[PDB]
């Protein structure tokens, strides 16, 4: 970072990117046969239940292996963009 303000902006951007990646992983976890009624284009009143249950998604991911593979794949796909920020916040004289 050039100064402290740039460092704070980078920290906020990293936090928001991690939050977005976690949201993407949570969305990708729904691609199973159990949520076929919810993924269909119809009227479901349980839309808020899938969002408010934030602490259950991690527990469900840690128990299943296919869910874990899907989650890590989605996390890598969403974290490539986060890694791409180094060329924006990095100077040309950076040794790394």
């Amino acid at each position: 970072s050039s100064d402290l303000q740039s460092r704070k902006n980078l920290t906020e951007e990293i936090s928001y990117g991690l939050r977005e990646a976690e949201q993407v992983c949570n969305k990708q976890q729904l691609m199973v046969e159990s949520w076929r009624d919810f993924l269909a284009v119809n009227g479901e009143d349980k839309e808020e239940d899938s969002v408010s249950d934030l602490a259950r998604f991690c527990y469900e991911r840690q128990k299943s292996a296919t869910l874990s593979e899907l989650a890590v794949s989605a996390f890598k796909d969403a974290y490539r963009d986060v890694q791409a920020l180094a060329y924006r916040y990095g100077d040309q004289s950076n040794s790394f």
Partner: protein, 113 residues
């Protein structure tokens, strides 16, 4: 899978059928006591698949399969080829109709066939 204790000696009862009585009866071998049965129910078990206890977490039993993904279809809002397709019924329609869900993390669009 049901069990009860006769009020006489407080011991387990085994079900039996009598051709002459033509009714369900319970009598234990400890004492010569016979009592009438209730609801004519001798077995009632809820069917569950909890056979491999403490083993489904280590080995992936694949209880909930993942939905297939295709790349031939093309999304409308975005130009992404990867999408999830599955079959489900409608709100009031009959039969199975094909659905599609976009796999783009930034699109979030779903459409029917």
């Amino acid at each position: 899978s049901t069990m009860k204790f006769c009020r006489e000696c407080n011991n387990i009862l085994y079900p039996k059928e009598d051709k002459e009585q033509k009714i369900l009866l319970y009598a234990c071998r400890n004492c010569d006591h016979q009592e009438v049965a209730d609801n004519s129910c001798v077995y009632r078990n809820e069917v569950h698949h909890s056979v491999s206890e403490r083993t489904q977490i280590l080995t992936d039993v694949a209880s909930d399969p993942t939905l297939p993904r295709t790349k031939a279809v093309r999304c409308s809002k975005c130009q992404h080829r990867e999408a999830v397709f599955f079959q489900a019924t409608a709100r009031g329609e009959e039969g199975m109709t094909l659905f599609f869900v976009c796999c783009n993390p930034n699109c979030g669009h779903r459409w029917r066939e």
